[PDB]
Amino acid sequence: DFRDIESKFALRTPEDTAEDTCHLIPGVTESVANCHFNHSSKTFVVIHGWTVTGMYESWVPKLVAALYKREPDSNVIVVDWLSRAQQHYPVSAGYTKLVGQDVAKFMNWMADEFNYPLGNVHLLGYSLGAHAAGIAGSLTNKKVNRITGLDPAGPNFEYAEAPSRLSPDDADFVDVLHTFTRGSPGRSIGIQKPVGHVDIYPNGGTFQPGCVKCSHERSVHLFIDSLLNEENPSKAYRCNSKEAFEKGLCLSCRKNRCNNMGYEINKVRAKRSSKMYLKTRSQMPYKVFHYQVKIHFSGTESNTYTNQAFEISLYGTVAESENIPFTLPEVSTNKTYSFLLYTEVDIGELLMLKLKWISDSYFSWSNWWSSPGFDIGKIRVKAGETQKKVIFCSREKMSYLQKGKSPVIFVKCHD
Amino acid sequence: DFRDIESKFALRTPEDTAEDTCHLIPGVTESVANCHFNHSSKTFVVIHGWTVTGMYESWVPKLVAALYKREPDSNVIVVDWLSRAQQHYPVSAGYTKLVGQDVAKFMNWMADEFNYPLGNVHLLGYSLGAHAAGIAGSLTNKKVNRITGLDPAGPNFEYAEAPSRLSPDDADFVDVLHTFTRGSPGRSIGIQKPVGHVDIYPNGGTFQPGCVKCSHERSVHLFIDSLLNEENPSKAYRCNSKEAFEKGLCLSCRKNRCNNMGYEINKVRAKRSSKMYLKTRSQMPYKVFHYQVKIHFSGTESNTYTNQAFEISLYGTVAESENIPFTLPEVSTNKTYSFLLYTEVDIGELLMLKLKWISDSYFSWSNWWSSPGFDIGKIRVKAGETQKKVIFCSREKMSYLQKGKSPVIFVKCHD
């Protein structure tokens, strides 16, 4: 052996939940005999990240079961961070480059022991483990092809240098998921910067409101539910900022302005640190569909903004939605607005649109159980997947805005 | 003069509400000078019917306004029943044939005074006036072409002879409207027999539930709203009985099994005293659309009938309906039922069907807020107008019957 590794190794098997089946000893010894290894196989390696107490991360069994059922003949290896974990948090950040040197010796081992092509390997991890993976990928003699960092750490790595962090040149393709950008960068965990080729801000990137501490457990749950549901990947959209995407002007994707999420990013490289966006549900598998609208208003009386309590329903060929309350901070005459539609079901082909503006909490009455209304019609839509430039229309009576008991309907017409 | 008429005559004008403008004196005197008459015109004559007190029927101004706006250059003439009215009710029935002889001398007058072709005249009336009109049409030397009797009388004319009543041979085409067949034939007003070529039983023919006495008054209202709305006549359907039509097996009209109502009966004669049916609304103009359904049930558990509290909604291209509660006295597994859909609006082309079986009054709970349900799908429909043999289908989840909060949806499919 060259550098005596203190971290114990474990090449895991699908018949293993939360223990070690086969320990791979360091040094150039027997490796394929005790631990099963296939050269014509997939090698996805993980790093256990920062643990405050002495505990192995409880989400490993569902993890290794998910990657083993997703890909047969898989070589999954985990390292023990607890050999150099139970110390101070910046001191653990100091030990990140030593464990990076350890995994550096690891992928330098079979580079000449087995002469691996290193074009079929995967490296992934979270918190300080993803940072050590980025350091190791920065060190690499032969450039690694893929890395999916999960939710990284915070105030230890502030304006650090590129070999000491994740970088686009650290791999052929770098992906990252900032679940938790909430709070101060110098205090809270999470970096507010597009550190990789692509970066994700799920549920706005601040925090998932499902409510444990709910910051990296999400980042592994959406990844495992992305890789299980391989036939319908979640479609992320390139945009400029959080609120610009929330208004919904970044859902065209006529050119490369949108891509998938999770395991398959469709192998698009040479990126300019662009911002890529999603919304998500909470505690059911996360395949939220997206839609954007182009609403039109009219009226010569020129009334102004009052309230944001509006609800809309949707009926379609495949499924149905009851009601989705939303918030529009500006509403007036002769103006076009837009807001996002996040749906838990696949509506599919469209027939008609249902609208219910009761506003029961925020000014339902408005001085005669009715508001001074506008005339609403010619609402256009755009689907978050593929393209749908279709034209709708309204009818005569229910184009008027009315506060409470207002079942406004819409209808498709093509002429 | 041959027979000195006691009834005063009035050839009415559109500038007349409830009075006499021009009195036409009896006997062969001047007739076209004082009262305006055009030979190339339409002559629709009326008879004021039975009045308990001394009163001219208050619905004459809207009547004569409606026939004058419907047909320009119209010769409308009314007689005074009050000359021989204010006596006993069978004694008034005795005077019906004397006023029939009076109007007999009337249409025998210009048969040789002006040599009228008598193929452009109309005779109409109600209560005993329609009976006297039938007697006069039975007497006629040249056969009259048209008569629209309104709601006739009751116990005076029970199993009477054909010259003493309305009959198919009394005219070329005889129409009648039994609004009120409720009660005993020997006590209540109204005959329970197809006295004419066609007969109508509106709202089942018992009574219109709009709630005055609400009987004959209703009759004249549906006739005037039929003649005002000439572009969309109410479509009556030939059937066998009241409940057979109420179940809805008489709405095909592939052959002559349906016709219009009001003024225009499409000139179909030589009838075999068939029963012809309608439903109607109350105190708005009466153009109720009709639909019939072919619902299918399934299930091997073989559950039986419990309740009849079901509600259904309809969404379409043109309009919408909120909910229409109905009653089905038999519901079970693997059985096909049918019930009528009476709508106040024109739904038009169809997209999808909405069903809400809350049954909040009649057993909404059913021991766990849910009932042991059936699987429902493949519902066919048939429009009351023209034909619509279209095929629909259901989806996977909401085919199950559930008591309360049950938004069952349906979808059109053609493959």
Author numbering:
A (entry chain B), B (entry chain A): 36 to 246, 267 to 470
Sentences from the paper on this structure:
Lipoprotein lipase (LPL) is a secreted enzyme that is active in the capillaries, where it hydrolyzes triglycerides found in chylomicrons and very low-density lipoproteins (VLDL) to release FFA, which are transported across the capillary endothelial membrane as a source of energy. In addition to acting on triglycerides, LPL has phospholipase activity, making it essential to regulate where and when LPL is active to prevent off-target hydrolysis events. Independent from its role hydrolyzing triglycerides, LPL on TRLs mediates lipoprotein remnant uptake by the liver.
Using cryogenic electron microscopy (cryoEM), we determined the structure of an active LPL dimer at 3.9 Å resolution. The structure shows that LPL forms a homodimer associated at the C-terminal domains (“tails”) of both subunits. This suggests that LPL homodimerization, binding to GPIHBP1, and LPL helix formation are all mutually exclusive states. The pore in the dimer structure has a bottleneck with a radius of 1.4 Å, which is sufficient for the carbon hydrogen backbone of a fatty acid. The pore has a highly hydrophobic section that could accommodate a fatty acid tail, potentially aligning the hydrolysable ester bond with the active site residues in a relatively more hydrophilic section of the pore entrance.
